[PDB]
Design a protein around this ligand. Structure first.
Ligand SMILES: [O-][O-]
Ligand SMILES: [Cu+2]
Ligand SMILES: [Cu+2]
Ligand SMILES: [Cu+2]
Ligand SMILES: [Cu+2]
Lengths: 533, 551
């Protein structure tokens, strides 16, 4: 310490290497030196001890729990949420992860590759960059978690044993410790959802009413995550379009937003410009991990279940976290490319531009001193010696955006992250009557879409709230069709981690129509008595 | 076998300090735990990690049942058919011996683990636990501690064990009951053991899976498709569709079937022991219930036509005769099938290969299982009479130690009685007769409906008007389904009319097979079954489905 974050060092045989789509990269590798390097290096990092600040646990620990120091910066986590430095704090955080993995790759080569092959393996390490998960791209008819994340094991090369491939536990599948995270040595223990009783990260694996020993490793219910990722209005199960892809398309193609509007859910005391990067990212966290531990009533089919990615304090432990944030960085770079003058340039985000991005250090070549990273340091992501295919070929970026992700009606949503004292919740919006026992997801009658509060005696910063936006065109057309042309009143339910409706929460929900005009104000829907909080 | 001599199956040898130890319910056994848990985990881990040339490896022991159809213990294989008996009256007795073999191998591995690992101070106490341990059973028909479930242990990827010589120290280790994993894809094992019979990509699996094989995912996902135990639980709790409507109480069909099986009097051995068919009231048999559980644990449909966000299909080893024995739950399932056989024997004491059909098979050699014949001084194969009394293999069940009819009702009959008592004193059953070879040996599922069938959704309890299923796990074959509650519901919606049973034969692609013959009928008696003259009241008919869903 300090650990200087630089990105992977420049090598002239490797001009601005790209971060590839992880599904494309996995298929290239198997259709495997880089795959071996990534698997082996990430395994080594996951097995480093807690007192090593470049262990996987400690790197994930920068984000949230267990809220310790990192790199000599005293330990809420370090992560930036609901502020305009969300994209840039995470830009540096993803680069730290990438850089540590690359360093571990070089160590792996020194340890395991014979002298005669070191140049070949080093070539591959120097070309590798952290792949991104394209959560909004149809997987090589539907959106999906990465192929590699759904694989318990992965086959790798053994250097010096040509045609000596071997199957190993996949470090992208889960992060597993040797004991329950609640029992780790001080001060690293993780001690709402029983994350203290988990040894491994899980997706939808934590459900009430099963033995607590099941929670030690609740499994990776990637089929369930995929279903959530493809959320869309209920009626489309009677032509569907996944809302996540439409939201991403709109984020990338809508012109005229300032940085403050694009960068964050933060609303400091319009609606057309409330589709923002952070809100989409919050929904993806919910969809990957699950946040509901139980459901009232009797149900044969159990669609709930909770996991690490839905929860701010522990989401960073799931290896997909980094791949998600890699794409969030990619989306930022794309938006920057097509909105090149909009950088901390509005009267709301300007104040935050010079925030130190603690705990991340760099060397100042002007002061000749170690300082914290600041947003302007990473405005050009290529300064960190990586790029994306889509931003290298800028000339045709609009066409590529259309090929990947392509009156109007929109829903606006304004809410307090601390409406429940800081606990997470999901805002579900419906057109028409709400089923008092089924108000949760796309299988719930009349469901149109959700907004997840990715948060987790406590109140928000004075004057600050949070915003999101949902597409509503197709769902309003269906509703009119079934309802004699009535413009629907949006109905909402605020759902907590017990699958109950929090009657006392008020959210501002409105429907707007195209220049957008407000055409209906939303109202809370009642649910059954056994389903009320 | 090992050494180059036959492997003699004895069951765990008798020790006078250990009189007829019981096979416990695996959830109860787990919940009270922890030396026996440690011994079972460490021994089974060693057995699973044994090399393919070792005939007491997990792979080769599973290999006896089906694929890859090799020899075992000097007995030629390559019959493709395995050594297992299916659709014949020796089904319960062949499996009785098979389960005992597994149990004996585990016990012997426990003794070796103690010899290599346990300090002098603890050896006699660990030896005493090995001698008291017997293979637990999975009670698939008992409510878990409102619903049927896979065992707790089967759903845990890791398990904490003791470390001998390190007091109070425990280590979390991969749970050998969660899955069986090899070091490579089973399709590329060293000859002759490759798994390569079947249409699902089992050749592309390195590990066993529950509901994890689906079309349209990268083939490397199939190497280990995972354990979707929540989905398997859902399947295990199959019941008529109408019971998920508000204002109606549900009963798990599996529990109703098992209570019927155990309580119905007057079956001969041939009716009880097998699906084999060469009065429909007597067609509820052990093998048919076992077949449905195989399906519900593993999943058999790889695909479904059309577009579906919620994907309720998926295939896994337990549904597939050639590879089912590789899933560790297989043995726990078959341990309960042995227990159900012992219960039924206890309450049907004269009914042992007692009919003209089964008498023919009573003397069949149960290959490949050897034992030493003390009266002729020869190593011979097991025969059914050798295992008529399961206690001769030095194990027992708590339920067979005495009161049995009351235990059967307490365990399997309370929910059925509670809901049936709400309706009139009548019973309805469905009879189902099919040919196991109707699809060339390919497996298939027979779903029955009362009322109109949704031509895009004819699959499971979520399918409109679904009544129940019969699974062809694989002379004719028969099964029976409870129908009393579904008939009541249909009558209330149809001004008293008796429903025509409608059936669909579904293949592994989720498509309807139109040339698979199934004989379905609905039968009625006055009086409730648990308190006898059944008459046919309706003939079945094949349901049509949407054109895109037709095979
Ligand atoms: O019968 O497996
Ligand atoms: Cu975060
Ligand atoms: Cu995040
Ligand atoms: Cu079998
Ligand atoms: Cu079986």
């Amino acid at each position: 310490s300090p650990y200087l974050i630089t990105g992977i060092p420049k090598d002239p045989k490797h001009p601005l290497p790209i971060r590839k789509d992880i599904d494309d990269w996995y298929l290239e590798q198997t259709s495997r030196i880089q795959l071996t390097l990534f698997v082996e290096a990430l395994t080594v990092i996951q097995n480093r001890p807690l007192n090593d600040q470049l262990s996987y646990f400690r790197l994930a620990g920068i984000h949230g729990a267990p809220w310790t120091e990192w790199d000599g910066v005293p330990g809420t986590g370090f992560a930036v949420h609901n502020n305009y430095t969300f994209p840039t704090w995470f830009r540096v955080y993803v680069t730290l992860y990438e850089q540590v993995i690359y360093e571990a790759m070089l160590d792996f080569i020194k340890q395991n590759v014979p002298q005669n092959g070191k140049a070949d393996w080093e070539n591959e390490a120097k070309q590798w960059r952290l792949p991104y998960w394209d959560f909004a791209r149809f997987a090589r008819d539907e959106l999906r978690l990465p192929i590699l994340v759904t694989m318990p094991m992965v086959k790798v090369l053994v250097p010096g044993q040509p045609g000596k491939q071997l199957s190993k536990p996949n470090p992208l599948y889960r992060f597993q410790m040797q004991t329950l995270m609640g029992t780790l040595e001080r001060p690293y223990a993780i001690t709402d959802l029983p994350f203290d009783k988990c040894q491994s990260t899980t997706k939808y694996g934590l459900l009430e009413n099963y033995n607590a020993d099941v929670w030690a490793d609740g499994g990776q219910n990637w089929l369930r995550a995929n279903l959530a990722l493809n959320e869309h209005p209920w009626y489309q199960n009677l032509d569907s379009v996944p809302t996540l892809q439409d939201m991403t398309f709109r984020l990338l193609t809508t012109g005229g937003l300032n940085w403050g509007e694009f960068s964050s859910t933060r609303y400091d005391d319009a609606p057309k410009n409330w589709m923002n990067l952070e809100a989409i990212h919050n929904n993806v966290h919910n969809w990957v991990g699950g946040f509901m531990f139980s459901r009232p009533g009797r149900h044969d089919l159990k669609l709930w279940g909770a996991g690490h990615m839905s929860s701010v304090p522990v989401a960073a432990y799931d290896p997909i976290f980094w791949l998600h944030h890699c794409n969030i960085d990619r989306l930022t770079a794309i938006w920057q490319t097509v909105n090149s003058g909009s950088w901390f340039n509005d009267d709301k985000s300007k104040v935050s531009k010079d925030d130190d991005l603690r705990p991340f250090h760099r060397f100042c070549e002007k002061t000749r001193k170690v300082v914290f990273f600041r947003s302007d340091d990473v405005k050009d992501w290529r300064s960190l010696n990586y790029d994306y295919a889509i931003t290298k070929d800028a000339s045709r970026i609009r066409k590529e955006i259309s090929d990947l992700y392509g009156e109007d009606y929109i829903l606006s949503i304004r809410y307090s992250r601390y409406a429940l004292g800081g606990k997470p919740f999901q805002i579900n919006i419906f057109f028409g009557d709400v089923d008092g026992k089924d108000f949760y997801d796309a299988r719930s009658q009349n469901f149109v879409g959700s907004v997840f509060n990715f948060s987790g005696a406590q109140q928000e910063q004075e004057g600050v709230l949070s915003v999101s936006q949902l597409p509503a065109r197709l769902a309003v057309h269906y509703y009119k069709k079934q309802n004699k042309g009535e413009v629907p009143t949006p109905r909402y339910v605020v759902v907590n981690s017990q699958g109950k409706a929090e009657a006392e929460v008020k959210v501002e929900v409105a429907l707007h129509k195209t220049d957008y005009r407000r055409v209906a104000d939303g109202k809370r829907a009642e649910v059954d008595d056994a389903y009320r909080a």
